[PDB]
Structure formats: C-alpha cells, structure tokens
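Components:
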Amino acid sequence: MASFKLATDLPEWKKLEETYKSVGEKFSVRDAFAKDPKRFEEFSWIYKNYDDSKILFDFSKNLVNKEILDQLVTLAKEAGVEKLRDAMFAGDHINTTEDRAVYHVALRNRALRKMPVDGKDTAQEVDDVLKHMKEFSDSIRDGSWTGYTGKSITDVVNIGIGGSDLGPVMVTEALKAYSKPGLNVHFISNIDGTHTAETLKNLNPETTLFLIASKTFTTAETITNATSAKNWFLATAKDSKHIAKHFAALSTNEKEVVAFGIDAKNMFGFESWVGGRYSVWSAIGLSVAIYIGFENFNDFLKGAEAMDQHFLTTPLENNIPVIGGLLSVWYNNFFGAQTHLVVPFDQYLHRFPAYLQQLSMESNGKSVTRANVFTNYQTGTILFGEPATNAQHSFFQLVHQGTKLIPADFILAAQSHNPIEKNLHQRMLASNFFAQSEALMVGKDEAKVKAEGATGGLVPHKEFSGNRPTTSILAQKITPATLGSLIAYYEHLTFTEGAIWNINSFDQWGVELGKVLAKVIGKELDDKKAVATHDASTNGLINQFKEWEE
Amino acid sequence: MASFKLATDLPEWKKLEETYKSVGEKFSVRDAFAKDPKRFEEFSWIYKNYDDSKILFDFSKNLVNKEILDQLVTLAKEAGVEKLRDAMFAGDHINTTEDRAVYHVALRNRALRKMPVDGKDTAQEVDDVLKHMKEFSDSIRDGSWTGYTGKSITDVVNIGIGGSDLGPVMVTEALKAYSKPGLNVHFISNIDGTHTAETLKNLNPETTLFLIASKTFTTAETITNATSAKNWFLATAKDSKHIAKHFAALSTNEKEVVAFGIDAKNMFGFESWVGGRYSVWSAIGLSVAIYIGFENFNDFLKGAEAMDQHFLTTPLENNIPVIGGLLSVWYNNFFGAQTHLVVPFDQYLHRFPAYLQQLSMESNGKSVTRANVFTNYQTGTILFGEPATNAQHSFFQLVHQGTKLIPADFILAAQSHNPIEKNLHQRMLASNFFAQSEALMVGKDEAKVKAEGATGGLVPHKEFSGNRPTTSILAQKITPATLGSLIAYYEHLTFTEGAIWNINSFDQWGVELGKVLAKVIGKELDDKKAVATHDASTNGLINQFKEWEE
Ligand SMILES: O=P(O)(O)OC[C@H]1O[C@](O)(CO)[C@@H](O)[C@@H]1O
Ligand SMILES: O=P(O)(O)OC[C@H]1O[C@](O)(CO)[C@@H](O)[C@@H]1O
Ligand SMILES: [Cl-]
Ligand SMILES: [Cl-]
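Structure:
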C-alpha cells in the first residue's frame, strides 16, 4: 500500500505550486547564469561508468535553481521515491495490479549480487540464460551452427512487436559499428503483410535463422507472423524436422513455444517480472548478441548495471536519473508542457526516441494511483524525437519560434565510430549540438533584430524568445557500455516520474480493450455481409471496407 | 495586409470560447450517436480522386456536432481562409515576410491550367522540368544512361536534408511496391559522418548515381555531404570529367550547382515559390521518378492536383482539408491539446508521420501574425506518430489510459500490395484499425470492469474513459494517386490552420539563429584551446568535448 493517495496531496506539491507562481513561471535562465557564476558546475554532473568512461549530464539551461530543485527533492522524499526504489531492488511485488516483481535490474546483475524474488536468488538463473545466449550467438557468428543443408547462417530475423521489437531494432542500429560484414539482422513486427513480404523477399531459407520474440508467446501479430515465416521456410525446406535448425524463441512461456513446434533446447527464457519495455537486457536481446557478439552485449548490460548502482546509492540531490525525473514533473505538472523531446545528435541512435516512447509512455500513461483512486493531475508526458541535424530541418522551427514549451534532451558523443575526413563531419555535428541549446537559451530580442537589419513589421518575425530549456548529455563515445547506461538513465527517470505521480509504471491494462474488440471484428471480416453490431461509425467503416476489399 | 490582427479578435472565436464551456468541454460522442441516427453520414465524406478511386474521411468520432462545426466554419469565413486560399492559387505573394508566391499547387498542374506568378504563366516551365525528369529517369531505369566505365546504374543516392530528404524517403518507402528489383535508392542526410560511411560502404562508384538535393544549394550539411560523396567517387574514378555521368542536382540555384562542378544539363530546377516542405512534387522527387518510374510519379502529382481542385472549389462545410484544419484548431485552441497523432495502419507508410512533422510544424510553429503582432494564443500542434499495429504496443497505452487529450488520425488501405495468405494479415490489420478507434470512443466503465471479474482496488486500473477522438481515413489502396491526395490533404489542412491563426505558414525564420551560432562554434573547434566566449553551459560543454574528442 501507498503512504499517500494523490501527488496533489503531498505538502511539497502545494508549496511547488506557489514556487511556480512566484519564481518558476517567469524564470529567466539568463538571469540565473548572471546571479550564479558556478551555475554550470552546480547543475551538471559527470557519470563515471564501470569501465571508467564518462557521460556529462548538463541540466543548467533548464528552468530550475537551487530553491526549485531542493523543493523537487523534498517532493521526491514525501512521495517515497527511495522506499519504492529499494523495494524494486529487493525483488518486492511493486507491480501491485499484476502482483509481480519488477526486476529488469536483475537481468544485468553481472556482479552476481544476491537479488531475490520470492526469497530466492535470481542471479544464477539469469546468468545461466546469458551463458546459453553466449554459446548460441558464438555458434551463429563462427559458422558452426549450420542450417538444414549444412550452410552457415548469414541472416537472422527477429519476429516480435513492441517490447519484443523496438529494443532489438534500436540497439542493433545504435551499435551497428560493432557488427560483422555478411551477418545481417532483420525485423518483422507489423501484422501488415507488407512487413513479412518485404523482409523475406531476398533471404535464403537455408541460411536464415528466426528468433520468435514474445514475452507471452500469444501476441496475435507475432504468432501469425511466426506462422507465416514457418510457412515460408517449409515451402523450401519441405520437412518440419528442419525447423529445429532455423527457429529459436525468446519468451517466458515454454508451453506455447513447444506447442508452436520450437524445440525447448532452442528457447531463451525469461520471467514475468521483466516488463516488455524493459526486456532488451534479457533473452530478448539475443539478436543484439548475434549481431555484435556476446561480449559487447555483456558490456551493454554492465553499463546498465553501473547506472543502476548509481541510482540505488546516490542521494537524491546528486542522483542523475532522479534529477531528470524531477525536471520532467516540474515541466509536466507545473508548466503544463505535454511533451518531452529527445534528440540524438547521432545517426546510429535514429530509433532511440521510438524506443524511449514505449519505455516512457506505456509505463506512465496511467490515470490511477497505487491507492486505487483516479489522478486529478497530469501523468505521463508525450515523448517524441528524431536525430539531429535532421530534426533541425524538420520541426526545430516550432521548438525555436512556436507557442509551446518543449523540454528537450540533446545527446552527443565526443568521438564518432566514423571519423571520416579527419573528423570534419564530427566537428560540424558537434557545433550544431552546442549551438542549438545555446540558441534556445539566448534567443534574439527586438534590438538585435533591428541591429541585424530588419525594419518595420518584419522585425517580430525574426525574434527568438529564448529561455527555452534543454538538457545536454555528452558522452565520450556511444559504446555498448555507454548505451546501456543511457537506457538505464531513462528507465530510472521513468521510475522517478511514476513514483512521484504514485502510479504503477509497470502494468499496461490499457491495451486489452483494443485487443478484445479487434478479435470480434476479425470474425466479422470473414464474410462480406454488412454489419450493424457496433456504433454507426465503426459499422460504416467496416461496411465501406467490405465494399472496397479484395 | 491582413483584415484582422489576432485570431482571438474574431467575433466567432469569442463565441466558440462560450460554446466550448457550454457544450464542447463535456462533449459526449456516445450521446451524439444516440441523438443523431445520421451522425456517420453527416460527419463522413467520400473523396473521389481523378482516377475514380476513393478515400473515406470519417470525422464522426470527434468531439464535434453541427452547432460546433457551423461555428468553426463561420470562424474560417471571418479569418478569410477562402480569400487567402484563392490568393495562393492566383500566384500572389502570400509568403509576406519573404515576399514570395506559394505555388506548390503549380508543380502538379498536369492539366496545364493558367497558373501565373508575377503575371507570367508557370504551366509550361514546370512541365519542361517534368519532361526532363521523365527522360532522365527513363534513361537510368532502362540502362541507357551508363556510368564512367560504360555500366548501367544500379544505385541512386539522394543527398539532402529536411525538405530535400524527408519527402524522397517517405514516398520511396510508401510506394516501394512499385519499384524495380536491382534498382535501389539510398539517402544521405545527416552531417554525422556515420550517415555517409554506412550508406557508401557497399556501393560501387561505377554504378552509383548521386542526386544533390538542395533548394538553396548552400545548406552546410548537404554541401559537405556532397563534397564527401564526390571525394568517395573520385577516390575510384580519379578524373573530375567522370562526375558528369554520376552527379545531378535538384535545386533553385544554378550558380552554386555549377560552382560545385555539376553540369547545367544535369540540373533539375525549381523556383523560390516552392517551400522545401512542399517540394516533393518538384525536381526534388526525381529519386521517386527513378525508383518507381515517371508515370507513377505523374500519377502521384495528379492525385495532389485533384485534392487541390477539391480544396479550391468546395464550400467550407464539405471541404475535407478545411474540416480537418477546423478540428485541429478546436482541439489546439479550445481544449488545449498540444499534440496531433498520425498513425498509418500501413508498414509502407512508416515514414509518413516524420514527413508530416516538417510540413505541419515548420509551417505552423510561429508566434507572429500577418499583421506583425505577437499571438496571444496557441499556434502549431506537435505532430507525432508511428505505424500500427506497432504503435499499439508502444504508446497506445497512454492514448487509452493517460491524462492527455491526443487527437488522432488513423489511416488504412482496404487493399494491400502484399495480400499474403489470401489476405489473412490484411484482415487482421484492418480489424485493429476499426477496433482501436472503437475502443477509444466506447471506453469501459466501472460496471463493465466489475462484470468482467475485477474486485476492489483493481477495478479503476482497468477502466477506460472512452470519449477519445479519432479521425479514420480509409483508402481503397495506397496507389501513387492516393498518396498524392493524402499529402495534399495535410498540406491544405496545414493551410487552414495557419490561415485561422493568421500566421505565415510559408516562412521559417526560426532556423537562422542555430545556423549562425554553429558556424561560430565550428571555428572554435578547429583547436583544443578552452573557450570562454559563450554562456558558462555552452563554454563548459565545448571545453568538455575538447578534452574528450579524438
Ligand atoms: O512480448 P509480447 O508478449 O509479444 O508483447 C508485445 C508487447 O505488447 C504489449 O504487451 C502491449 O503493448 C507490450 O507491453 C509488449 O512489449
Ligand atoms: O533544401 P535546402 O535549401 O538544402 O534546405 C533544407 C531544409 O532546411 C530548411 O531550410 C530549414 O529547416 C528547410 O525548410 C529545408 O527543407
Ligand atoms: Cl514558449
Ligand atoms: Cl483525456
């Protein structure tokens, strides 16, 4: 049980409402730098990773000062962020609505600390599956695991959706510099048949390995897609006994895996207490281990592990994911900003925002607290983004000159995996990273617009308000370890947010209605008889489809 | 000059504020269907394309009725949406801040109507460039245009960013079913050197064609990327005279094209009155013409042309892009929703939301009206999305159970280009399209949660508010013509929004400050001396980078 019902009940929440009116709403970042010559030092933190690599988190261009952050910290203490965190790490069933542990932290327990669920250490069982993942990925990569005609595997297709897809996609894209030429990964996720047809078009069944990734192993799209891949494989291979060399499963559900015709020796298991949107660390990351090798995958886990130890052991006021979460609440609940922009100045990280969208929004898009009452305040933010410099030429116009507050996180690596032309492109990329946050803060007033040459009614069109907040995250390099630490940062930021809002960040009851309603309609699409069983819009859309379908 | 200063000054705006309080804020869609047995018929419209194909636009699950829509129409009339539209089509300089025509409509004038800028018909000059595009793309595709060693082209790389990139990417992805095996398109856009290195990795200079796409032909990232591709080509080809077989330009700026070492015969020109985010219809779409053939590209243009004729000639109250724009304003300015979700139930359309993000947000992210005063009300929405069914497993949890209003557009084709398994996947995909909008509208109350088996404090966690609005857009098939009509729909929706807000949807002054600030910093990154020329955050970030860079 929670210690409180609603976040709005916490005494510091009421205090922050007043602080918002007196100091927050008209906060001047320019004035803050001028008041405090140590602002950068006070509002930036160096994270040191397990391998002594570093990441600078600079919050100093945010609409925050010591007064405000101290209050947000007091709010975090009243909301029991620490008690909930420690319960999570203790293996307690803090996913209250499903009565489950929340133990993604245990997936990357490479130190083999004691980490019990139901009073039973999980360290060894997690480790065993990783050992299996190492053996199998090494086999694929060295060419000793051969297909049904005795050939080495050249292509691996992950089939899965949401938590079983976005992670493998994002991380294989992000760490693509660590891949081996000739060993390619592919993804089928959408039920849209285009996805199957386009992905299998040029693949050879003799040298293609499928990974069927589903926590439940009952997701409608995934089982259907896996059946279609099995059909495609057998159209060439003919005999079902060959499936054992070409189909593995990443799942919690051994029963359904085996019922599907996948051998238990080819299952890479995980438990219920791994949420899908926190599963890349598990068996789900097998595609990653194959693409870039197990040791790199282990390094990614150990980056998460080090950020977990940071989150667990650091006082709130210096606790980097906590500070990120506190600013989010500040913007979401006091300013009323609805969005949170995440912009990697990194092409490899192009699918990093899409990944964070699930982690953040599926966790925190809730309307009911742990005391089982409805919120009377905003919960999860809408998270979006694209890589820079692309994003500068898409929607940054609105970020600079629009009417909406859009808290933004910019991410850059100091070193590129691709330092072509003796780093000409890298320095240009970096210059944009620095200048965009600079621009958003400093703006450009009327006087400067006039000095730069505009007259009359053109003048206001060229003004920049400035005072637009950013968080800058500078890594040395986007290694596996760095990426693991960065994801864990957003995981614990997400944690802090949900803890303050007193929501359950770890369930997803909101997907069930669409699932049940789609099955009903799917049966109705088995003929071309007009339907009148729904609302008139749903009926009209279905009936128009029936007239227009093949 | 504008007829009014601020949208908030229009008498109907003030009326709508009252209508919002009395009827809008607590609007019940369920009650609306029960009051009006003809609601679906009254709030849905069939668009008929030039080829007699059709698209159903169903607005009936929105928070609107006849009273509200009539008021929004009166607002559109007070704001002079029609006068501004007709000025645009007349070739008038409605891009007031740059004193330019806004004439993307003239790019797809395949009927060769008289469409003058500065009193001079553009029909023939636009047509001439399309004839050049047809000849050249036919040459590439039939193999008669050979590289410097006499081989046919196998790969085409578009180099360009923002308006010069997102369109080519989105449309080649969307219409990929119409492509030819062995003739591939690639994109370099980011200045991040990863983008160049990864794209050119496996290409052969002897059979690779570059399209340097830049309206200005001065964009820093694009010229740098084009120089790098020219370096890569010449590392193999050795002699600069071979460039003429491997480099074309899509630009307004012949001077800079020629200074770059591209031959004028290999330039595909367009004019200043084509905004980048409305340029795919121009020479910029050359990659599309090569990928799927000129005739398919012409069909795409003629789809835009037909939607333009719809927009131009239809009374507001039946004018489909107008209705979409009016609902946007309703949600943005009366409910205070900050976002607009666009979800294609279509894998090919995976980059359709990212494209719309520029069109919408770069157009409408403005704070200054055509009367040259600052707005005191919300302008552009934050547009985001991913394809379904993927999006259902990412952030739809928040769309169903979060605390934010998120107006959503769902798009489905009744027929797939990939109807595998006698349409098993297609019917499943469609069932999700229908069920998601159904679910968002109908919700699930306390009583039903109890009937379905929940007790005690679990009950509220499983409730769905419902009354969550969607627009459903059902096409027969995503042909070129359909896609052209769909983009033009968002273009004219964007138009309507900007017209009501009295902003200039056609400039982008907001990108200049970041550009100027990045050049300053770029010069500072040419050494490793600490810098103190900026704010302390910008200085600290730069200095940390200098310590950590290669
Ligand atoms: O891994 P599974 O069980 O196929 O589920 C896929 C996804 O669908 C959800 O259950 C519902 O969105 C996600 O949380 C999950 O990641
Ligand atoms: O086509 P160009 O001139 O290289 O410009 C690229 C993009 O950058 C902008 O000028 C600024 O974002 C866009 O409007 C444009 O599409
Ligand atoms: Cl603002
Ligand atoms: Cl709501």
